[PDB]
Write a protein that binds this ligand. Structure first.
Ligand SMILES: CSC[C@H]1O[C@@H](n2ccc3c(N)ncnc32)[C@H](O)[C@@H]1O
Ligand SMILES: CSC[C@H]1O[C@@H](n2ccc3c(N)ncnc32)[C@H](O)[C@@H]1O
Ligand SMILES: CSC[C@H]1O[C@@H](n2ccc3c(N)ncnc32)[C@H](O)[C@@H]1O
Lengths: 262, 262, 262
C-alpha cells in the first residue's frame, strides 16, 4: 500500500484538497513540523498534508524545520512525497503560470542542516534527487489535463529571505539553472535520506530579474493555484494504482548503505 | 531634508571629513554598531559617520554587525548611505587606485544574517541594489574631479577572512564579477530593507590573484584615500541640493510591501 | 630539522606506516584533535600521524575539528603536513585509483570556521595554497614508483555530508574544478595561517556523477590505499634530505604579516 505526503508551498497549500480530513499535531527528534499534519484522502488513497510555511505562512524559508517535516511524514507512514513550490523562471520558455516538474537542483543555501545524521555518518547519493516514476505520472497527467508543463528543469535554491541580484540571476543561468526558489534544498535531500520517493511541482510565478516582488509572486500564485490542485487530485489516484514494491526497496537500500557505522 | 550616513571602510574612514563633529554611542535591537556615530556636516548637509571596522579596525568582515550599523544610521534619520570599501580588481581595466561605482553584487558569504526580519517575513527585491540617483552624482562628480572612475561594476563579496585562491579568483571572473571584497553583502541588502538609498565607492587596491596581501592593500589605500575623501566632500553638497521626495517614497513602499504579515 | 605531520583520510590512515610509534592524546585552544597523535618515524624522519575522521572514522567532514588538528600538529613541531584524501573525479583523464597532487581549491563549504583568528584579524593569502617544493617531490616520487599521477588539479570542497547532484557536478566542471571532496577546505587554509608547508595526495575513487556511493568509494580506496602509503614512505625520506630553511621562513613571514593588530 502507499501513502502520499503532500507539502504545500506558498499559496499552494489548500487543505480542501483532501476528503475526510483529521488534524494531527506531532513531534519529532528534531522538533515540531511546520504545522499539524492533515490526514485525509484523495479518492481511495491515504494522504498527509503539511503546509511548509504553516497555515499562517509565517515561517521563512531559512527557518522551516525541513528535518521535522520529512521525519514526521516518514513516521506517519508516507511512501511518497509530492510537494508544490513557487519559483522564479530563469528561462524564456518557462512562462509565469507554467508548471515545471524539476529533476535536478543546485544548492545555494548556507545555514541549513541537510542531514538526519548530525551525529553515524550519512553520505547519501544525489545523482537523481527526484523520484522518476512519480515525475513520469505527473508529466503524463499534466498532459491529460492540457496544462503547460515542462518535463524537466534545474532548480537553484537560494538561502533568502532576500531575492537574488541581477548579477546572481544571470550567473545562475550560466550554471545551468532553470528556475529558482528558497525551499527545494534540503527538503529533497532529507527525503532521499529517509528513503522516500520525492517529487516537486514547481510553479513559475515570475521571470526573477534577469521585477520579482512578493505581490507579483502572490498574485500569479493566486491565479494559478488551481492547476497544482487539479494535477495532484488527478495524479495521486494514478499512483495508488501502480506497483512500487521494488522502487521503494531500492530507495530503502540506498539510504541504509549510505550510513557509516562507528 | 536629507541626512547622509557614511560608512568608512578600511583605511577610508577618516572622521576629519566632517565639520562640527560630535561623538554619539548608540544601541540597537541587534546590538551595538561597530563604533560611535560621528555627527557632523559637510557644508550645510547633516552627516553621520561610522567606521565599519571600528576606529581601531579590529572587527573582521565576518564579525561586523551590519544589522546594528544600518539600523543605527536609519534611527538617526539617515535618508542616504554612501560607503567606501577597499576591494581587489578582477579586470585589467580596473587598475589599483581606481574608483568603481558598483551597481551589482554576487554573494559568496555564508555565515551572515542578511535581514532585519529574523522573526514577519521579509523578501526584499535586489534587482537594482544600489541607489541609481546617488550613483549618478558620484560618477559625474568623479568626472569633475578628473578621477579615474568606472561607472559600474559587479562586486563579489566573499566570507573571508582569508583571501581567494587563484581558482576562485578566475572562477569569479567567469561569473561576471569585476571587483572583490568582504563587506558589500549584507550591508547593501539591509540598507535596501531599511528603505535607505545606498551607494558604494569601491577602491581597487590590487589585482587579487588572477600578489594580494594586507600590506599591499593597506599601502595602496594610504596612497589613494584622499580620492574617496574628495569625492565624498564634493558629492554630498550636491545631494543636499537635489529633490528626493519621490525617490525615498519608492524605497519606503518597496520595503514595506516586501514584508509578509502573520 | 624537519618533522612531517600526516593527516590520514578515509581508508588512507593506516598507522602501520610509522616505526617506533607512540600514542599521544593532546588538547588545544580549539578543543581536542580528531584522535590521538601518533609519533613515529619513516627512516630517520620524525613524523606525526593523525587520522582525520578518527581511528573509528565516526567524525563527518563538517564536524572535523580542522582548527584543533592543525594547531596540534603545529604545536608538536611539524614543519610540513602531507595529507591523503579520497575524492571524486570530474575529469575523464583522472581515472579511479589515480593520484592527484592538487595545487588549487574552490570552496563550497558553508558552516566551517576557517581561521585561528576568530577574535587580531588575519587575512591570509591563498594564491598558492599548497607547498610547491613538497608537491614537486611527491610528483617526482610517484614517477619513480611508476604510479599514475596528475601533476596538478583543482579540488572543489563541498560541505556534505550529502554527495553532489548531477547539476552541481556539471556546474563544478565549468568552474574549472578537477576533483571533489569534503575536507580540503579549511584544512589547507588553516595550515597556511599556521605557517606550515601543506600538500595533499588526492586519491580519485570514482567519477562523481557527471554512480558515486559510500561502498563504491570505500571499495576503490581499499584497492588503492597501498599507493598512498608507498608514496608517503618513499617521499618523506627525500624531504628530510632537502633544505627548507628559507622556504619555512617565507611561510612564517607571510603568516605573521597577515595579522591586523588592534
Ligand atoms: C513570498 S515570495 C518568496 C517565496 O516564494 C518562492 N519564490 C518565488 C519566486 C522566487 C524567485 N524569483 N526567487 C526565489 N524564490 C522565489 C520562494 O521559495 C520563497 O519561499
Ligand atoms: C585589510 S585587507 C582585507 C579587507 O580589505 C578588503 N579587500 C581588499 C582587497 C581584497 C581582495 N583582493 N579580496 C577580498 N577582499 C579584499 C576586504 O573587504 C577586507 O575587509
Ligand atoms: C565515505 S565517502 C565520503 C568521504 O569521501 C570523500 N569523497 C569521495 C568521493 C567523493 C565525491 N564524489 N564527492 C565528495 N566527496 C567525495 C569525502 O571527502 C568524504 O569525507
Amino acid at each position: 500500500a502507499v501513502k502520499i505526503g503532500i507539502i504545500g508551498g506558498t499559496g499552494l497549500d489548500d487543505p480542501e484538497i483532501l476528503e475526510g480530513r483529521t488534524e494531527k499535531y506531532v513531534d519529532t527528534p528534531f522538533g515540531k513540523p511546520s504545522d499539524a499534519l492533515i490526514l485525509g484522502k484523495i479518492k481511495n488513497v491515504d494522504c498527509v498534508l503539511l503546509a511548509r510555511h504553516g497555515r499562517q505562512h509565517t515561517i521563512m524559508p531559512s527557518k522551516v524545520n525541513y528535518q521535522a517535516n520529512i521525519w514526521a511524514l516518514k513516521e506517519e507512514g508516507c511512501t511518497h512525497v509530492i510537494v508544490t513550490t513557487a519559483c522564479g523562471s530563469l528561462r524564456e520558455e518557462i512562462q509565469p503560470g507554467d508548471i515545471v516538474i524539476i529533476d535536478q537542483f543546485i544548492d545555494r543555501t548556507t545555514m541549513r542542516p541537510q542531514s538526519f545524521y548530525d551525529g553515524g555518518v550519512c553520505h547519501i547519493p544525489m545523482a537523481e534527487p527526484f523520484c522518476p516514476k512519480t515525475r513520469e505520472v505527473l508529466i503524463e497527467t499534466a498532459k491529460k489535463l492540457g496544462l503547460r508543463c515542462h518535463s524537466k528543469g534545474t532548480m537553484v535554491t537560494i538561502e533568502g529571505p532576500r531575492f537574488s541580484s541581477r548579477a546572481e540571476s544571470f550567473m545562475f543561468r550560466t550554471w545551468g539553472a532553470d528556475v529558482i526558489n528558497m525551499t527545494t534544498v534540503p527538503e529533497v535531500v532529507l527525503a532521499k535520506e529517509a528513503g522516500i520517493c520525492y517529487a516537486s511541482i514547481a510553479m513559475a510565478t515570475d521571470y526573477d530579474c534577469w521585477a520579482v516582488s512578493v505581490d507579483r509572486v502572490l498574485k500569479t500564485l493566486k491565479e494559478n493555484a488551481n492547476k497544482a490542485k487539479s494535477l495532484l487530485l488527478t495524479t495521486i489516484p494514478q499512483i495508488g494504482s501502480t506497483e512500487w514494491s521494488e522502487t521503494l526497496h531500492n530507495l530503502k537500500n540506498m539510504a541504509q548503505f549510505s550510513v557509516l557505522l562507528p
